[PDB]
Every structure is written in structure tokens, then in C-alpha cells.
């Protein structure tokens, strides 16, 4: 049923997440994205409500794809002999946050506030659906350049949310928290806050704070760009070494620097058009 129902187009890239092609749904001419994932490479499996064995990524996507969110939705999927195939939304025009920052450099605080907020809502939604993304970073965040709306991709590293300790991590090293580096254990929310702490620094300074493990474990943040006494506070609080000294989402979202956030449409007018 696959090859008939959608119309494949260009490639859009590949990595440790598979190979994505542009594509159109014939039924409506919705833009979509088609993501092929080989079975032989899938490390992490699960089971859907009806009790079928699929890749975790699919489980997680289905859980977060109900109604609107800052999360690129799974519209459908297929199984093949050696691949799985996932149809996803394709916002148009779009750009990932890595390219954006690689182009425009560090972001004005007003713009970083808008983006960071949207990531926070998006991550709150995942956590609400029982999902931990486990790999939050610039290149896993897309920007719909017209509506000013950020959306969250790949879930390939990613787990069912749980309150006990995690001992695996197939994510991004430089975004990993000191507790993991040192002890090979961490807890979801606290770890996620850390990664957000890294995300926010990247946004305002145009590059990540830490390169090597020694730098992470040492937890000391040097600012290369002019950033507000207040943003620095929020970043540092998010990158506290002791997980228990990091903020909750509420606390992050009630932090002074997070107040008077621009809505997505006005963000695009001022900062993207
Ligand atoms: C653009 S449209 C679009 C819409 C939905 C997704 C994808 C692309 N990509 C991003 C492609 C890749 C391109 C090279 C630069 C790094 N990035 C991650 C993807 C990737 C990973 C998991 C899920 C997905 S779903």
C-alpha cells in the first residue's frame, strides 16, 4: 500500500536516524516526510496498544502525536522486509535550529526567549504523554519559518518516561549531564533540564558551552557573547552539577528572563520574514 499512497521526492539527509525523503500524500497533497529505518540497525523495540512489536521511536511518536504540539507528528507507518517506514509532517518552508544559528549566529534574547519557551512547551507535552526525548538539541528542533513555530524531531534515542534511574543513553555526548559522564546513571527530567541548559546557551552564545568531559564534570560556564545578568542565571541554574539543584520546568517557565514571551506569529514577523 505504501508506494502508491505517497509520492516520493528528493532526499533530505541521513545519519543515525535513517534516511528521509521529501514526499507528498496523493490523497490531499499534504507535504510529508518519509523516513526509512533499517531493522538490522534498530537497537530499541517496544509494543503498541494492540500489542505489535515495533521500534520504540514509533511507540513514542504515536503517544505524542495526538492533537497539536511542538512535535512533528507521525501520520502513519509501514513495515517492510528489512526497513520500517514512517510518514511524518513536513512544514514548508523550514529550517533546523543548527543551520539557523550556523547562519545568523547568536540570537537576540527576545528571539531565544520565544524559541526556548516553545521547546519547553514541547518537552512538557512529551513528558505529559509519558515520553522522554533524551536528545534535545538544535538539530532536533525545526523552525517553520512562516508561522514562527518550533517542532521537535528525532525520537530514535528516546524512552518511556519513568521515575526510576536510567542507565542507558544513546544521545549526544556534549549534551549529556555530568551525572551520566561520571556514574553512568541519571533521571529523565533533571537530565532534560541540563540538556535545555545547554540548548539555551547555544541559542544566546551561538555555540555549545562544553566540548570535553572534564569541562562538563567541572560545570563552569564561560560566556563568549554579551548575555543578560538574568539569562546567565537561568542557564547556570539549568546546568547545576547536582541534579537536585536544577530547576523544574515550572521554575524555568516562571524565571524572570522567561516573562513577556512573544507569540509564534509575532516572532516570525520581527525576526524571520
Ligand atoms: C526538513 S523536513 C523534516 C521533517 C521531519 C523530519 C526530518 C526532516 N528529519 C530531519 C533531517 C536531518 C537532515 C540533516 C540535518 C539533521 N536533520 C536531523 C528527521 C531526522 C531525524 C529524526 C526524524 C526526522 S523527521
Amino acid at each position: 500500500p505504501l508506494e502508491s499512497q505517497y509520492q516520493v521526492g528528493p532526499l533530505l539527509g541521513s545519519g543515525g536516524f535513517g534516511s528521509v525523503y521529501s514526499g507528498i500524500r496523493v490523497s490531499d497533497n499534504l507535504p510529508v516526510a518519509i523516513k526509512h529505518v533499517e531493522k538490522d540497525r534498530i537497537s530499541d523495540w517496544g509494543e503498541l496498544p494492540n500489542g505489535t512489536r515495533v521500534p520504540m521511536e514509533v511507540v513514542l511518536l504515536k503517544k505524542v502525536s495526538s492533537g497539536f504540539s511542538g512535535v512533528i507528528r507521525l501520520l502513519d507507518w509501514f513495515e517492510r522486509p528489512d526497513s520500517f517506514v514512517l510518514i511524518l509532517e513536513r512544514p514548508e518552508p523550514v529550517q533546523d535550529l543548527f543551520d539557523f544559528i550556523t547562519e545568523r549566529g547568536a540570537l537576540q534574547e527576545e528571539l531565544a526567549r520565544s524559541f526556548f519557551w516553545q521547546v519547553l512547551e514541547a518537552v512538557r507535552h512529551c513528558h505529559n504523554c509519558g515520553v522522554l526525548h533524551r536528545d534535545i538539541k538544535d538539530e532536533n528542533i525545526l523552525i517553520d519559518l512562516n508561522r514562527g513555530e518550533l517542532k521537535l524531531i528525532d525520537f530514535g534515542s528516546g524512552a518511556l518516561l519513568k521515575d526510576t534511574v536510567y542507565t542507558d543513553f544513546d544521545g549526544t555526548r556534549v549534551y549529556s549531564p555530568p551525572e551520566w559522564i561520571r556514574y553512568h546513571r541519571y533521571h529523565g527530567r533533571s537530565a532534560a533540564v541540563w540538556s535545555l541548559g545547554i540548548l539555551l546557551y547555544d541559542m544566546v552564545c551561538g555555540d555549545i558551552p562544553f566540548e570535553h568531559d572534564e569541562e562538563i564534570i567541572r560545570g563552569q560556564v564561560f560566556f563568549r557573547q554579551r548575555v543578560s545578568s538574568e539569562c546567565q542565571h537561568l542557564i547556570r541554574w539549568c546546568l547545576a552539577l547536582r541534579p537536585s539543584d536544577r530547576p523544574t520546568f515550572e521554575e524555568i517557565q516562571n524565571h524572570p528572563w522567561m516573562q513577556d514571551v512573544l507569540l509564534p506569529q509575532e516572532t516570525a514577523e520581527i525576526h524571520l520574514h
Side-chain angles (χ1 to χ4, degrees):
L2 156 48
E3 294 94 313
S4 57
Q5 203 179 341
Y6 302 96
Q7 196 211 20
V8 181
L11 195 89
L12 301 174
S14 34
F17 58 81
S19 313
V20 174
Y21 301 76
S22 171
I24 318 292
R25 194 163 52 190
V26 304
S27 332
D28 22 350
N29 310 256
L30 230 221
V32 289
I34 309 180
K35 186 198 213 200
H36 295 71
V37 198
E38 264 199 283
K39 289 180 176 169
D40 303 57
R41 219 217 337 93
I42 293 161
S43 70
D44 223 307
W45 301 76
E47 192 162 12
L48 335 97
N50 64 218
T52 338
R53 167 214 175 70
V54 304
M56 192 63 99
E57 190 172 352
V58 178
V59 178
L60 302 180
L61 285 159
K62 206 135 89 62
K63 291 170 79 82
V64 300
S65 290
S66 274
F68 314 130
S69 28
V71 186
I72 264 129
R73 307 262 233 77
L74 182 66
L75 303 177
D76 203 32
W77 62 274
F78 302 90
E79 171 157 18
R80 277 165 159 187
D82 304 279
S83 64
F84 272 91
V85 182
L86 280 68
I87 310 308
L88 294 144
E89 293 177 290
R90 181 161 58 77
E92 207 51 48
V94 89
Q95 193 186 25
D96 81 18
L97 179 54
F98 176 99
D99 292 332
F100 195 88
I101 282 156
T102 287
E103 265 194 28
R104 308 199 157 179
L107 276 43
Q108 283 151 228
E109 306 203 351
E110 193 184 52
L111 175 53
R113 190 178 299 98
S114 172
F115 284 6
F116 198 60
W117 188 263
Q118 296 194 238
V119 174
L120 272 153
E121 290 292 325
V123 173
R124 282 183 52 200
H125 171 252
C126 287
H127 291 200
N128 211 250
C129 299
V131 181
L132 200 72
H133 185 290
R134 279 223 293 199
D135 187 32
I136 288 158
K137 61 190 206 202
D138 46 12
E139 57 179 299
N140 291 334
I141 292 164
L142 305 188
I143 305 169
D144 169 348
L145 271 6
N146 283 340
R147 301 176 182 281
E149 292 166 11
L150 270 65
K151 299 255 182 236
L152 223 80
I153 61 182
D154 118 283
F155 280 90
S157 354
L160 290 167
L161 186 65
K162 89 191 184 181
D163 286 290
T164 54
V165 72
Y166 283 93
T167 63
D168 74 300
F169 176 72
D170 176 55
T172 325
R173 184 121 191 136
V174 298
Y175 277 79
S176 68
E179 63 268 22
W180 159 257
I181 302 308
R182 294 193 44 69
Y183 308 138
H184 288 75
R185 38 205 291 158
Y186 65 97
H187 286 93
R189 300 180 171 89
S190 21
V193 163
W194 173 276
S195 68
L196 291 168
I198 306 280
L199 178 63
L200 178 52
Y201 174 105
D202 188 42
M203 294 202 307
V204 298
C205 296
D207 203 1
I208 49 163
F210 305 133
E211 203 177 308
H212 314 300
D213 295 355
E214 308 71 82
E215 320 207 56
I216 294 168
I217 287 158
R218 181 160 176 256
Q220 204 163 318
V221 192
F222 293 109
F223 287 87
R224 72 196 82 207
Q225 221 81 15
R226 158 61 206 203
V227 191
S228 72
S229 299
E230 297 223 333
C231 186
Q232 302 197 16
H233 185 273
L234 178 51
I235 289 166
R236 292 186 156 115
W237 184 17
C238 277
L239 301 175
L241 287 184
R242 312 187 56 251
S244 66
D245 291 347
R246 285 167 214 164
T248 39
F249 295 132
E250 175 169 18
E251 293 183 318
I252 289 171
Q253 273 175 313
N254 292 313
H255 183 282
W257 188 84
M258 290 281 255
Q259 297 312 290
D260 316 312
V261 72
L262 299 180
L263 290 155
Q265 204 72 237
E266 33 174 335
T267 314
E269 268 151 12
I270 305 164
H271 296 280
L272 306 171
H273 288 342

